[PDB]
Amino acid sequence: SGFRKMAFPSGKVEGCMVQVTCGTTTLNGLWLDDVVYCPRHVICTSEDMLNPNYEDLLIRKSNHNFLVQAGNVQLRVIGHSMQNCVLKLKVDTANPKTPKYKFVRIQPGQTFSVLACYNGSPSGVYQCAMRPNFTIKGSFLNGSCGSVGFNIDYDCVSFCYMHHMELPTGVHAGTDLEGNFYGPFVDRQTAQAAGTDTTITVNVLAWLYAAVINGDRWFLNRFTTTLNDFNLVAMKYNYEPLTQDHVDILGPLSAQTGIAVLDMCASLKELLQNGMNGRTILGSALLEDEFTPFDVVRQCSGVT
Amino acid sequence: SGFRKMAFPSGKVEGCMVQVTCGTTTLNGLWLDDVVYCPRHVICTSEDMLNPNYEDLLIRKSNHNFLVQAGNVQLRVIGHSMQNCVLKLKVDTANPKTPKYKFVRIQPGQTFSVLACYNGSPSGVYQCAMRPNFTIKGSFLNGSCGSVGFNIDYDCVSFCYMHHMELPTGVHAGTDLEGNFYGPFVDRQTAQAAGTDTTITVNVLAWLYAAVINGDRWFLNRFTTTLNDFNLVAMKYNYEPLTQDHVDILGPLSAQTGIAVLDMCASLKELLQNGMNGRTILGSALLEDEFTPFDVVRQCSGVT
Ligand SMILES: CC(C)(C)NC(=O)[C@@H](Nc1ccc(CCC#N)cc1)c1cccnc1
Ligand SMILES: CC(C)(C)NC(=O)[C@@H](Nc1ccc(CCC#N)cc1)c1cccnc1
Numbered sequence: 001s002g003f004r005k006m007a008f009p010s011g012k013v014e015g016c017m018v019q020v021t022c023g024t025t026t027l028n029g030l031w032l033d034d035v036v037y038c039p040r041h042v043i044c045t046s047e048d049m050l051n052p053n054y055e056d057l058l059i060r061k062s063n064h065n066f067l068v069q070a071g072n073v074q075l076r077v078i079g080h081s082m083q084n085c086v087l088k089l090k091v092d093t094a095n096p097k098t099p100k101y102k103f104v105r106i107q108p109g110q111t112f113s114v115l116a117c118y119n120g121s122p123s124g125v126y127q128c129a130m131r132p133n134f135t136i137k138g139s140f141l142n143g144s145c146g147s148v149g150f151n152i153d154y155d156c157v158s159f160c161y162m163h164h165m166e167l168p169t170g171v172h173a174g175t176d177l178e179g180n181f182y183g184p185f186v187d188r189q190t191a192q193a194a195g196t197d198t199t200i201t202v203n204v205l206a207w208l209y210a211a212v213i214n215g216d217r218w219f220l221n222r223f224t225t226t227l228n229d230f231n232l233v234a235m236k237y238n239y240e241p242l243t244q245d246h247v248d249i250l251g252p253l254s255a256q257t258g259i260a261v262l263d264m265c266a267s268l269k270e271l272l273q274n275g276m277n278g279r280t281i282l283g284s285a286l287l288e289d290e291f292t293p294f295d296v297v298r299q300c301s302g303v304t
Numbered sequence: 305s306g307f308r309k310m311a312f313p314s315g316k317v318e319g320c321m322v323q324v325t326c327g328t329t330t331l332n333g334l335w336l337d338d339v340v341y342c343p344r345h346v347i348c349t350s351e352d353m354l355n356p357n358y359e360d361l362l363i364r365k366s367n368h369n370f371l372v373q374a375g376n377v378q379l380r381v382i383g384h385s386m387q388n389c390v391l392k393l394k395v396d397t398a399n400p401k402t403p404k405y406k407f408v409r410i411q412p413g414q415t416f417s418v419l420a421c422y423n424g425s426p427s428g429v430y431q432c433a434m435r436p437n438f439t440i441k442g443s444f445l446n447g448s449c450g451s452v453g454f455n456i457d458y459d460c461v462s463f464c465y466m467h468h469m470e471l472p473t474g475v476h477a478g479t480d481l482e483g484n485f486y487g488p489f490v491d492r493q494t495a496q497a498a499g500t501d502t503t504i505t506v507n508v509l510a511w512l513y514a515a516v517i518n519g520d521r522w523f524l525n526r527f528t529t530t531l532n533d534f535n536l537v538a539m540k541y542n543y544e545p546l547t548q549d550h551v552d553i554l555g556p557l558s559a560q561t562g563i564a565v566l567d568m569c570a571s572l573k574e575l576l577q578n579g580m581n582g583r584t585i586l587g588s589a590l591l592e593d594e595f596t597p598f599d600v601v602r603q604c605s606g607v608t
Contacts, residue, residue: 004428006428009426116310123608125314137587278579285589299427302420
């Protein structure tokens with residue numbers, strides 16, 4: 001028992017982290033097979049970031065201008081190309097530590113682990129969720145760009161995020177591994193405000209199920225609700241609408257606990273309307289939304 | 305910017321995890337050089353756990369009864385010994401992935417990462433603190449025993465915890481890597497109640513400094529206090545007494561923010577007396593105490 005914000009073991013991803021330097025800019029790269037992926041803004045100076053023309057800036061760069069270092073050994077760059085907002089640097093050596101991997105583009109509400117890196121070196125690992133406004137609330141300093149987000153299915157690493165930017169509000173934006181930003185964000189130092197950071201309702205419900213499995217049951221009430229009634233309350237509280245797809249996804253947790261999904265919705269509705277009254281659920285004084293139903297099942301069953 | 309509950313990158317520890325089976329009991333072992341460390345209760349049946357005589361139970365076990373498997377390959381056991389509550393199984397092969405390491409016994413209030421494992425396989429990594437009552441609030445299921453807690457200083461892994469038990473209250477107990485339990489706990493299925501789980505005051509103050517560094521400043525007030533006055537309030541709220549040693553440890557954060565330690569104590573005193581009033585600090589609705597002053601400095605400076 002016990003329920004923690006758990007990240008995936010990061011070893012398979014640590015084996016892929018490299019340092020990429022272009023001119024005076026140093027950030028992280030991801031080395032998979034003979035390709036190093038990194039944010040294209042490695043080619044920018046701080047001044048270029050205000051209004052960069054990436055195609056134009058890239059013309060002035062050759063293979064030898066991209067310095068790639070894996071540990072304390074230099075990799076030879078034999079090709080470079082821009083794909084959306086990432087650069088792909090072809091190196092002459094396949095990464096011997098390349099795990100089985102996929103590039104996936106996640107949906108808002110999905111969680112993943114981030115291996116925060118500086119100078120190609122891992123500093124820490126933490127669990128994130130793609131917010132409904134397509135930002136992530138990470139822990140990234142200058143030099144962390146190119147750090148990646150991922151999930152692991154047994155031996156397969158699915159890379160879903162590469163860190164590119166910090167918005168003026170301190171929230172983070174980045175791309176999938178095809179270089180496409182999540183949401184409307186662009187790799188330019190300009191006014192980019194994030195939309196409403198709504199709460200991921202299906203994740204809160206999953207976490208309430210994790211709470212019941214682990215003994216925290218005080219919030220269970222005598223009520224039920226309907227999807228439409230619950231959604232009127234969800235809208236009032238800036239929660240994402242709950243769909244029948246979310247109810248179906250919560251099916252296994254409902255079966256394991258014997259608590260019907262709509263009954264858990266009624267418990268969540270009362271928590272929204274009444275607050276916690278100074279009580280906690282799984283050591284939290286707020287409703288946690290960065291555990292998906294799959295995360296709760298995985299953690300509660302001991303999947304390796 | 306941004307502040308997350310971050311664990312150390314787990315790769316160096318993943319390379320040490322093995323599965324240990326003795327009879328019908330399977331748990332995890334830590335393979336460092338030619339020794340595999342694991343909880344001595346691997347020799348017990350579920351019935352033995354009610355009242356085990358470990359020296360007596362161990363007489364019936366030979367080297368060939370300890371089955372050690374690293375990945376899908378069997379290790380040869382050439383010796384075994386009991387040191388306090390751990391067994392040390394000498395194997396004929398040094399772990400080729402042994403990192404630079406130390407065995408450290410931590411103090412209450414210190415934090416560490418746990419690599420939760422099942423069947424010698426890593427399932428996830430999370431950040432813990434040794435509670436003042438010598439329990440940890442982990443996420444461990446049956447089969448997780450032998451999972452370890454650790455800190456990393458550049459390339460040196462300091463192992464501080466090995467998981468042994470879940471108390472009837474769902475909190476966790478274990479040993480250092482010399483097999484000595486933290487606190488008064490014993491490896492027996494008996495009545496073991498934990499003492500008061502007080503709040504680690506110096507960690508809360510460190511986290512309030514992390515909050516100020518990252519822009520959450522609403523809780524800063526116009527007051528100051530003294531150590532004695534603050535400690536009268538700390539006692540009332542089941543917070544650990546703050547000592548001059550803790551003030552000295554918070555010195556660097558005080559210098560960086562320009563907020564004197566006793567002024568931050570006065571802010572904490574008002575938060576204790578008035579509550580959060582529905583507001584949050586670093587996305588939390590409670591005062592977080594599982595970040596040490598060193599963790600805040602490390603995370604806020606990007607140490608790899
Ligand atoms: C655009 C600003 C806000 C300045 N930085 C970032 O948005 C990110 N850092 C960054 C570093 C260098 C370059 C190239 C320009 C040069 N040299 C581009 C970006 C960042 C910072 C903090 C946390 N996360 C991400
Ligand atoms: C003593 C009890 C409460 C039953 N288990 C534990 O305290 C721990 N499991 C455990 C497994 C096997 C053995 C040997 C007996 C056999 N076979 C000893 C201990 C545990 C469980 C859940 C989470 N953390 C740790």
